[PDB]
Write a protein that holds these residues in place. Structure first.
Motif, PDB file in Angstrom:
ATOM      1  N   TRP A 120       0.817  -1.197   0.000  1.00  0.00           N
ATOM      2  CA  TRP A 120       0.000   0.000   0.000  1.00  0.00           C
ATOM      3  C   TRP A 120       0.856   1.255   0.000  1.00  0.00           C
ATOM      4  O   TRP A 120       1.924   1.347   0.599  1.00  0.00           O
ATOM      5  CB  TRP A 120      -1.012   0.004   1.160  1.00  0.00           C
ATOM      6  N   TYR A 124      -1.088   7.361   1.781  1.00  0.00           N
ATOM      7  CA  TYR A 124      -2.453   7.283   2.228  1.00  0.00           C
ATOM      8  C   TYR A 124      -2.572   6.733   3.682  1.00  0.00           C
ATOM      9  O   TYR A 124      -3.670   6.554   4.221  1.00  0.00           O
ATOM     10  CB  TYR A 124      -3.328   6.473   1.278  1.00  0.00           C
ATOM     11  N   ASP A 126      -2.774   4.170   5.647  1.00  0.00           N
ATOM     12  CA  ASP A 126      -3.096   2.798   5.982  1.00  0.00           C
ATOM     13  C   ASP A 126      -3.677   2.098   4.744  1.00  0.00           C
ATOM     14  O   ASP A 126      -4.095   2.747   3.787  1.00  0.00           O
ATOM     15  CB  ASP A 126      -4.030   2.680   7.225  1.00  0.00           C
ATOM     16  N   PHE A 127      -3.772   0.791   4.862  1.00  0.00           N
ATOM     17  CA  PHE A 127      -4.337  -0.015   3.747  1.00  0.00           C
ATOM     18  C   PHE A 127      -5.769   0.378   3.398  1.00  0.00           C
ATOM     19  O   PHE A 127      -6.167   0.465   2.239  1.00  0.00           O
ATOM     20  CB  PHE A 127      -4.217  -1.481   4.101  1.00  0.00           C
ATOM     21  N   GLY A 128      -6.596   0.530   4.458  1.00  0.00           N
ATOM     22  CA  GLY A 128      -7.987   0.815   4.204  1.00  0.00           C
ATOM     23  C   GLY A 128      -8.250   2.118   3.467  1.00  0.00           C
ATOM     24  O   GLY A 128      -9.186   2.230   2.663  1.00  0.00           O
ATOM     25  N   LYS A 129      -7.464   3.138   3.733  1.00  0.00           N
ATOM     26  CA  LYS A 129      -7.550   4.370   2.989  1.00  0.00           C
ATOM     27  C   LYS A 129      -6.942   4.197   1.576  1.00  0.00           C
ATOM     28  O   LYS A 129      -7.468   4.769   0.586  1.00  0.00           O
ATOM     29  CB  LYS A 129      -6.895   5.504   3.719  1.00  0.00           C
ATOM     30  N   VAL A 131      -6.928   1.621  -0.432  1.00  0.00           N
ATOM     31  CA  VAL A 131      -7.781   0.929  -1.401  1.00  0.00           C
ATOM     32  C   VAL A 131      -8.846   1.822  -1.998  1.00  0.00           C
ATOM     33  O   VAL A 131      -9.483   1.394  -2.974  1.00  0.00           O
ATOM     34  CB  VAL A 131      -8.373  -0.355  -0.908  1.00  0.00           C
ATOM     35  N   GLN A 132      -9.073   2.986  -1.401  1.00  0.00           N
ATOM     36  CA  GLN A 132     -10.038   3.951  -1.959  1.00  0.00           C
ATOM     37  C   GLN A 132      -9.478   4.868  -2.979  1.00  0.00           C
ATOM     38  O   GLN A 132     -10.132   5.766  -3.462  1.00  0.00           O
ATOM     39  CB  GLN A 132     -10.609   4.758  -0.767  1.00  0.00           C
ATOM     40  N   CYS A 202      -7.852   0.001  -7.652  1.00  0.00           N
ATOM     41  CA  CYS A 202      -6.855   0.719  -6.849  1.00  0.00           C
ATOM     42  C   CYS A 202      -5.484   0.208  -7.004  1.00  0.00           C
ATOM     43  O   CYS A 202      -4.622   0.552  -6.192  1.00  0.00           O
ATOM     44  CB  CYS A 202      -7.251   0.669  -5.349  1.00  0.00           C
TER      45      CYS A 202
END
Ligand code: ZN
Length: 257
Positions: A120, A124, A126-129, A131-132, A202
């Protein structure tokens, strides 16, 4: 309830994840006769000397080797990429037979399996952000063919019996992902997606041209894993690959002449 079974496989995913029919879906067929060499592409930088694996996990769709991503320890940079991408996990896709299993194909050739090292973009946080974002992830894809054993895989193979079924995890420290790389870092690249739900667009894909070899024994141990949970009807974890999707308005670019 998605999977790779008879009634919930790739061809169904669009009902819960409509981007399955999107503009930038993965995998794709790599046509080596139309991918153009791009002299503006840089050599890939893979810095995995400080990578810290922590655990291996059967998630019911594959298994994940996880890493501590709380610092720049294991980073991908260069290549087609701007900035720095941190290793979070790797996993594989594989077949029931040696003639299938990869997600990407090369002139329609299917390999026995494909390794994905997922990273990632640190911009951004973290990973969760990540992927967006369209440039949130960089996935290094490596083909596997059956032949010689890969000694660097053997540690993974030997832990699989402890994570047979979905939901199971085991400590897995000190695993060195450098032992999964081929000699050459020549690659193809294109923009695409996660190959499992949620199928988000992404990913900068970086697919190595040179496969690694693993032995038939090694692959056979993959094929003894189960998609079910403990104490449920046995369904072997095989054919956990998504087929090639339409390239649409994308170009595949080669790092090499
Ligand atoms: Zn994958």
């Amino acid at each position: 309830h998605w999977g790779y079974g008879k009634h919930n496989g790739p061809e169904h995913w669009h009902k819960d994840f409509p981007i399955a029919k999107g503009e930038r879906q993965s995998p794709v067929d790599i046509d080596t006769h139309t991918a153009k060499y791009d002299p503006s592409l840089k050599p890939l930088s893979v810095s995995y000397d400080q990578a810290t694996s922590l655990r291996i996990l059967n998630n019911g769709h594959a298994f994940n080797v996880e890493f501590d991503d709380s610092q720049d320890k294991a980073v991908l940079k260069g290549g087609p990429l701007d900035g720095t991408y941190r290793l979070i996990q790797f996993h594989f896709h594989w077949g029931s037979l040696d003639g299938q299993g990869s997600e990407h194909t090369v002139d329609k050739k299917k390999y026995a399996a494909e390794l994905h090292l997922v990273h990632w973009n640190t911009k951004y946080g973290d990973f969760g952000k990540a992927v967006q974002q369209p440039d949130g992830l960089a996935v290094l894809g490596i083909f596997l063919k059956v032949g010689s054993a890969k000694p660097g895989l053997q540690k993974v193979v030997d832990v699989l019996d402890s994570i047979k079924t979905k939901g199971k995890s085991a400590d897995f420290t000190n695993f060195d992902p450098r032992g999964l790389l081929p000699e050459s870092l020549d690659y193809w690249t294109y923009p695409g997606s996660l190959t499992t739900p949620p199928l988000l667009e992404c990913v900068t894909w970086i697919v190595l041209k040179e496969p690694i070899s693993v032995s038939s024994e090694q692959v056979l141990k993959f094929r003894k894993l189960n998609f079910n949970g403990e104490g449920e009807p046995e369904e072997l974890m095989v054919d956990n690959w998504r087929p090639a999707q339409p390239l649409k308005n994308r170009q595949i670019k080669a790092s090499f002449k």
